[PDB]
Design a protein around this ligand. Sequence first.
Ligand SMILES: O=CC(=O)CCC(=O)O
Ligand SMILES: O=CC(=O)CCC(=O)O
Ligand SMILES: O=CC(=O)CCC(=O)O
Ligand SMILES: [Fe+3]
Ligand SMILES: [Fe+3]
Ligand SMILES: [Fe+3]
Lengths: 273, 273, 273
Amino acid sequence: MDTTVPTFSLAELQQGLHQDEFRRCLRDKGLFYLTDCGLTDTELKSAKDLVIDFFEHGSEAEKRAVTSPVPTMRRGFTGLSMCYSMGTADNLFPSGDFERIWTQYFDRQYTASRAVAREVLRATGTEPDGGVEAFLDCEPLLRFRYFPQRMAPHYDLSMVTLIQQTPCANGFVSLQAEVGGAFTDLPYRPDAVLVFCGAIATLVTGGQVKAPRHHVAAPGSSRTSSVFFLRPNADFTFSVPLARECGFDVSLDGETATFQDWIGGNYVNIRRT
Amino acid sequence: MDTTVPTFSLAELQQGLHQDEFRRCLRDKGLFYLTDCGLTDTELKSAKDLVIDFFEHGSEAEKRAVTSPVPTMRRGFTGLSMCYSMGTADNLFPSGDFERIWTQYFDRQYTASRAVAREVLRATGTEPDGGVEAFLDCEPLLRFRYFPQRMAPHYDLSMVTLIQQTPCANGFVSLQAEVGGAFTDLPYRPDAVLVFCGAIATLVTGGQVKAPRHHVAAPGSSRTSSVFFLRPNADFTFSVPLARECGFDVSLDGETATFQDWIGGNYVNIRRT
Amino acid sequence: MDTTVPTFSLAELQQGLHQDEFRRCLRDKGLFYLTDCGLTDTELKSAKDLVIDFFEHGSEAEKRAVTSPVPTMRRGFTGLSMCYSMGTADNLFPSGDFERIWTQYFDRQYTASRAVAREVLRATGTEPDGGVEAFLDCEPLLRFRYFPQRMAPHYDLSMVTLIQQTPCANGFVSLQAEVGGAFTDLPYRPDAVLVFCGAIATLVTGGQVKAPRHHVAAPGSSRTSSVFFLRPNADFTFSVPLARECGFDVSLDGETATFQDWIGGNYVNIRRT
Ligand SMILES: O=CC(=O)CCC(=O)O
Ligand SMILES: O=CC(=O)CCC(=O)O
Ligand SMILES: O=CC(=O)CCC(=O)O
Ligand SMILES: [Fe+3]
Ligand SMILES: [Fe+3]
Ligand SMILES: [Fe+3]
């Protein structure tokens, strides 16, 4: 009945500690807080401050200069509530300190994400087709969103998703996840990042990892979130019969398929039941 | 102007009776009640009782044991309102009498579905590419849903869909379908199953069969439905120009395509206009 | 800061006038009114009158005769609010003067659309793979919609979309587009058609053209719109790295891809952020 969202130290997992507790969490819950992963509250504030300054004080001209011509929220600025997005390349940076700060922040996120994904693979004895490092050298997307003073349940289609929130001034907890058949609060932890396992973790490990559903509840209620999707390459290859065995309703002829075969030609980050 | 949802006896259709009335119904309405198809109210109650018992009385542990790690509603239990899903293989059965009861129920549904699909093909002089039996040896999905005391209009992308409902205690009729340009009640019939023709019937027969839109209206209002989708294999092959002729807005290069080419790498069961 | 939706004369653009103003509009706004393109208010009324007469006075039998068996809104009549759709072939025409009127109207729309698309390509120095004329000999869809006395923001996935509205009797302006970070009215112009650049303009020109988001606001509030999507052929081919550079979140292996590879096997006309 234990419906508590656990916390693991990345460093401790890397030492081979708590493997049973970790495997069990992955199987039964698919989400956890992660400490000791190089992701500090002080840095979150560094990056958050300068993007919030851009959101509030950037001109329409400065904003347009870092807005994509198609409004995909893949790179640069998106007005909706506002978002800033980046990946490993093709970024759009406002002038000044922004690029140095956000490149470093992105890098630390990407490293942490690969590192925890590596532990998810290790804990489940999983060797992706083509090898672990090729699998993790992938197609990440970071999105930073400001929400002024709400979201339908879905599960993520990432390998893993890392989430760093800033809290509502009034102390309301917006993010919730299904745990043990009940929606459970997922509050800000100045000391920890939240990790959701995505459908790709389920797929790659042959069903050893749960992709939990989550949502944001409606109620000083403004908040921001940094969401880092670790997304596989288009050519990530998996077994078709094995996908069917763990609940994927695939329409795929023959025995192996790629991520592109399954999802199509545009990334899809989330899915509803 | 006759906007009445008709009923046909499967046995009678199999005898070659009412071919005109049947062809006309398929063309102009795309839905009908089906009697004499091996699907009894007593069996519906047998299967419904033991899954309702599981929904109400199963522990979170028992539920988790038959819940997929991705919440696709393909197999086993899904909490949302609750659902139980199954196909021809890879099933997740609660302990005891459940598996025997639900395997038999699934089988009778699958047989009825193939049998009526065979009559839809016969009535329209349709020989699917690769032959009738290969076409019908396919990828069915049964979903049983409990609705506590609502759904946007869509059409189904199945060949056919068979629906067995249990009624609201208060006698409200929830399911409705467009018939003759008007939404028409589709009440429980203890003696009959409701059949919707899906877009695949339209596609395979070269437009001889309508895929009607339907929805569920809001008002003792609780209800359950058993929905059996007869879905084609990924390699079902059809003519591209012929698909375009009957209203399919296909983006497909060249002259033939497969169901996977059209729909993509995950089954999609329903579509909105 | 100039958030005004501009107007260009097609004839003048064809003369090579206003190239700077046109390039800038395409880059920063992605939409404009178009005059002198062979599309008269008198013709809009000719075609609108006879389809409105059909909507109001056509029998269910006449309507069924020009309704597709799948409710895709690709061709013929769709009851929802009502729609009439057509393309270059496979049309469904009510009896009488309708076909002559609507074929001529469609043709004038298609010509105007190709002509302005040709200018978008010229202004941006773009040579589509396979050449300009092959690219423009494509898969257009015209939809004419009556709205009785509302739509979420999206951008179009067309090359260009041409829109001819009829106004609300009461003078309410329903259609709005993001311009300079603000939603801007897009009123009826008896003398001009509205052109939205779509995501395919963005893609083909390597990011030189914006695909603006737009929506319809809620308030004599009835209105109609004629919407002509100029949509590429399934085999339209583009550079994968170049698509990524302009914000497309593609999951495509290797270096080139087709429109079908990206979008899948059914046209998708619109997308949300
Ligand atoms: O997929 C994205 C999310 O679940 C966003 C969650 C959040 O708002 O914190
Ligand atoms: O596609 C599924 C349905 O139309 C479900 C209908 C129902 O609720 O009975
Ligand atoms: O994509 C279609 C539209 O944006 C329709 C706009 C309109 O209602 O005028
Ligand atoms: Fe999520
Ligand atoms: Fe349905
Ligand atoms: Fe649009």
